């Protein structure tokens, strides 16, 4: 049944293997740089998510096309 790999991967990426960050223990310049780096990471993550959404729309178009072709020919 052997689903421990999938759950382990998702959970570890969620909690352990994520970019674990301690942010409130740095100097003024260091804290500013860390905040800017995290802000860049957040904005790039949201950009990546939007790109994945656009790819999801493209996949929906492709799935509809494939279903239509199959129904027409079968």
């Amino acid at each position: 049944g052997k689903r421990q790999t999938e759950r382990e991967k998702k959970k570890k990426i969620l909690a352990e293997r994520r970019k674990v960050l301690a942010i409130d223990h740095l100097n003024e310049d260091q804290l500013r740089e860390k905040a800017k780096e995290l802000w860049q990471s957040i904005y790039n993550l949201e950009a990546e998510k939007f790109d994945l959404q656009e790819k999801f729309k493209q996949q929906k178009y492709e799935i509809n096309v494939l279903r239509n072709r199959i129904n027409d020919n079968q």
């Binding site: 970019k19 960050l21 500013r32 949201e46 999801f56």
Partner: protein
Amino acid sequence: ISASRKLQLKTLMLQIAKQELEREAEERRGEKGRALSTRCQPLELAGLSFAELQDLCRQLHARVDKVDEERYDVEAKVTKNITEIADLNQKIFDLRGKFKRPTLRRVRISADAMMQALLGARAKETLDLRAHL
């Protein structure tokens, strides 16, 4: 029917399609920027001391964890459906174009004008006979 409409038609269709594609790309980029601003607002650069910056960074790190789990979910999803896209594209090729894949070929280009070996054989025989004397 006129054989003149095809070239101009395909050029104009290509140009209109390219204009539509760049319009869609710019629309996607602008809507991406607007949505990104909505999900995470921009920061300020005036009047912040160390403590308020620290609090802002704590809120930003909580948002970092939130967007990290969101991105991990959507990234696993996109990986699985990109694999699905590849699998189904290969399936469609195996279904419809499985016979057209070996059909696209470059043949009938050699033997049509390759009858000049007999001349070489005749020249060789004549050379041997002439070399005899």
